[PDB]
Amino acid sequence: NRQTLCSLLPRESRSHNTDAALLPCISYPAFALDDEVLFSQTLDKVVRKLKGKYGFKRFLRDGYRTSLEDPNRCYYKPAEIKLFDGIECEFPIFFLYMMIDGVFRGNPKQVQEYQDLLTPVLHHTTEGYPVVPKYYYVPADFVEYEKNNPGSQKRFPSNCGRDGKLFLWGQALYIIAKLLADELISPKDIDPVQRYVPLKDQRNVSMRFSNQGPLENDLVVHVALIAESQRLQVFLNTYGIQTQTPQQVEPIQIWPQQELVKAYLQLGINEKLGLSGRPDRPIGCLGTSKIYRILGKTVVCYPIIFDLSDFYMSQDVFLLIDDIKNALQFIKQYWKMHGRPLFLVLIREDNIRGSRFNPILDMLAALKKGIIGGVKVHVDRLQTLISGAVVEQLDFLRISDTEELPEFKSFEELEGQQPDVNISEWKDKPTHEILQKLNDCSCLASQAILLGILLKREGPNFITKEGTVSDHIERVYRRAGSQKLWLAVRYGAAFTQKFSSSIAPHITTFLVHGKQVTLGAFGHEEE
Amino acid sequence: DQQQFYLALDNKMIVEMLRTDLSYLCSRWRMTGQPTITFPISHSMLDEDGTSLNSSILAALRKMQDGYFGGARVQTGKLSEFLTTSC
Amino acid sequence: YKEALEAVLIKGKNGVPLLPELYSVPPDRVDEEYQNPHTVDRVPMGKLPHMWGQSLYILGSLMAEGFLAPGEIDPLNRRFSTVPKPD
């Protein structure tokens, strides 16, 4: 959410370079922007393009309740939005919004100036009670003169009082703004949970305010090195890297993220309401950096980047090293909770075997040195890295008296040529001795192609020498992930329709930055 | 160490102490990395002529290159190579 | 050793078990245990409770009824000292 907000801003949306709806967002009651510059910039745009004497315009070319707008139609034709420039209705409620902004941020000049702007546009009832009009619209016979010179023609109030129409949102914001301006309520009163934190910005959880404040980010990440097997542990030991197997941190359960989602599935369960709990979505680096206490057992989940189930990129040790580097950089940038984040580094035998032995040890030696990718880490035992940290207590697993819930499966210790067969050579072959050609050939990519052809031509779950076509293809993909012949590791994932969870958020990350994405090969149909 | 006593001035005793001292190392190492014994050959470990290495030490040195000496696995090398695989 | 210890624990105060420091041979019955060993009835003497022994009794009770794990009382993993170590 915060990445989306920072990327979209200072624009409200793709269509709106600025919007008066930002004023509630970056000011009272949300104060959602924490970066002062982004805030300063975002305001300046709002004030420059929307401020007026009668109020704020909601957004440029706004046809809501304008003279040139047909009220019956609920939609605008693409050629109509050009007619709403200069004649946008000005909403006086944003005078109150910026008055509250000034009261909260401590500049009384803004409060005074905006009260002075609000006073002409305030209307009154028969009893002297002020009425904040919803908007001020130019008259239908002043539209051309307003377009020629904006702000030179008088505007009529939507609400005036004495008519029975009162803008209750505006009235309430008027009450709040007047109470704050008259100092009858403090900003800390209507903001008991501090959404506005002054430039003394430290120690607010989840609010980008870490211990160091809003400008320094020298976070130290707790990094526990975990080896899959006792042989892995003793072999990493003889090269100078100290690691602990899951059994050597025995009371502490190391979990895949998947089990953390399974545990969280019971959060918010309400059978009377028909509510199903958390949605099954991968917990990410920030979530897995927390230390969880489930049913009296303390659990730490290794980050998603070590899961060998979503995709086959993590089978490349180089991408594993840059994935660890990016994960640590991401935690450094975005972890702003009280405790120090804990990053379980899982070393697998497949990540070691062969020439892959060197880069993984380079990364582990960088971690032992204390700095990797500019991210300070603290490589030590998991027992020390878990002692005084703030634990996340999943009480919902016990309030429903599910103390006997099935014990979640913690991580368990373990105790060469170019393709001689061309694609067109045998695909064009109509006759079906290609099945015997599968036995004839010896390459594993050949096996992947052949049993993909078997899964398409000969049904989804046909049997073979190893077993069903589907599980044999899965075994072939797993095998290709191991011995590092990557034709088959791609073919298996493609022919099994394999997809990782990070991609839809990745496309969203591309899109919120202003980059439209097309997924389709050159010369074919792209979506 | 030769300044303390005379047990380091007998080259046949260097091998014998080294033989047990590797045996002590291999069976009793409980630290990260592999132990690194830096063994400097001194003029006293040469022959009385001064141009040949003493046979007892001479046998000891080749014994370590072949990978076994005194019941311990010896990976002979240069001190720079063992920087990353040591405690 | 739990049933054996539960039959030597001396009940006191509001039924709480107390670990006797030692069980002593009655003065008259010393000759009988001289001849036939470890059969005469002994009387509890010494400290009552033995605050040293009482703690491990509760510690043993805590770890035997699933209130504590060996790793939590031994976070430094000393319990794995007996596992074989490769040379």
Curated annotation (Swiss-Prot), chain A:
Family affiliation: Belongs to the phosphorylase b kinase regulatory chain family.
Q: How is it modified after translation?
A: Although the final Cys may be farnesylated, the terminal tripeptide is probably not removed, and the C-terminus is not methylated.
Q: Organism source for this protein? A: Homo sapiens (Human)
The entry's linked illness reads: Glycogen storage disease 9B: A metabolic disorder characterized by hepatomegaly, only slightly elevated transaminases and plasma lipids, clinical improvement with increasing age, and remarkably no clinical muscle involvement. Biochemical observations suggest that this mild phenotype is caused by an incomplete holoenzyme that lacks the beta subunit, but that may possess residual activity.
Its subunit composition reads: Hexadecamer of 4 heterotetramers, each composed of alpha, beta, gamma, and delta subunits. Alpha (PHKA1 or PHKA2) and beta (PHKB) are regulatory subunits, gamma (PHKG1 or PHKG2) is the catalytic subunit, and delta is calmodulin.
Localization annotation: Cell membrane
In residue numbers, the region (Calmodulin-binding) covers: 475-502
Give from-to of the shown chain within the full protein.
Answer: 275 to 820 of 1093
This one is known as Phosphorylase b kinase regulatory subunit beta
Function comment? Phosphorylase b kinase catalyzes the phosphorylation of serine in certain substrates, including troponin I. The beta chain acts as a regulatory unit and modulates the activity of the holoenzyme in response to phosphorylation.
Swiss-Prot record, chain B:
* Compartment list: Cell membrane
Modified after translation how? Although the final Cys may be farnesylated, the terminal tripeptide is probably not removed, and the C-terminus is not methylated.
Please give the tissue specificity annotation from the record for this chain: Muscle specific. Isoform 1 is predominant in vastus lateralis muscle. Isoform 2 predominates slightly in heart, and it predominates clearly in the other tissues tested.
Q: Which family does it belong to?
A: Belongs to the phosphorylase b kinase regulatory chain family.
- From the record heading the sequence, give the disease linked to this protein: Glycogen storage disease 9D: A metabolic disorder characterized by slowly progressive, predominantly distal muscle weakness and atrophy. Clinical features include exercise intolerance with early fatigability, pain, cramps and occasionally myoglobinuria.
What is its biological role?
Phosphorylase b kinase catalyzes the phosphorylation of serine in certain substrates, including troponin I. The alpha chain may bind calmodulin.
Subunit info here reads: Hexadecamer of 4 heterotetramers, each composed of alpha, beta, gamma, and delta subunits. Alpha (PHKA1 or PHKA2) and beta (PHKB) are regulatory subunits, gamma (PHKG1 or PHKG2) is the catalytic subunit, and delta is calmodulin.
Instruction: Name it.
Output: Phosphorylase b kinase regulatory subunit alpha, skeletal muscle isoform
Q: Which gene encodes it?
A: PHKA1
Range covered out of full length: 526 to 612 of 1223
